From a paper:
Here, we show that repeat number variation in predicted bacterial surface proteins is more widespread and we characterize a third rod-like repetitive region in the [name] protein ([name]) formed by tandem array of Streptococcal High Identity Repeats in Tandem ([name]) domains. The structure of single and tandem [name] domains from the streptococcal surface protein [name] were determined. We call SasG, Rib, and [name] “Periscope Proteins” due to their having variable-length stalk-like regions that define the distance that the N-terminal functional domain projects from the bacterial surface. Taken together, these data are consistent with multiple tandemly arrayed [name] domains from [name] behaving as an elongated, rod-like particle.
Based on the significant truncation of the N-terminal β-strand (Inset), we hypothesized that shifting the frame of the repeat by seven residues toward the N terminus of [name] would complete the fold. Sgo_R3 (residues 621 through 705) and Sgo_R10 (residues 1211 through 1299) based on this new definition were thus expressed and purified. The model confirms that [name] has an α/β fold organized around a single α-helix and two distinct β-sheets. We report the 3D structure of a [name] domain which, while also containing β-sheets, has a topology with no obvious relationship to the Ig fold.
Author numbering: 1214 to 1296
The structure:
Amino acid sequence: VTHKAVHEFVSGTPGKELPQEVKALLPVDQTDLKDGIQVTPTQPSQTEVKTSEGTWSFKSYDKTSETVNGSDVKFVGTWEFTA
């Protein structure tokens, strides 16, 4: 069975939604995986996004890796906002 790894971004700053400029940095899925394969999340191409109101900074993903075992993988990446 082939599997994939996908990415999701969240805001780490309560009350503040991610803007399109940050969402657009979401990496593409990693494809063609099989059970037994280790995966590492793709880095966002930029880790800092400046806005009129402040800065979004990429903190980290929730995991540094996952080894595929029967399911597709999701890595959740957190951005923090400072005004």
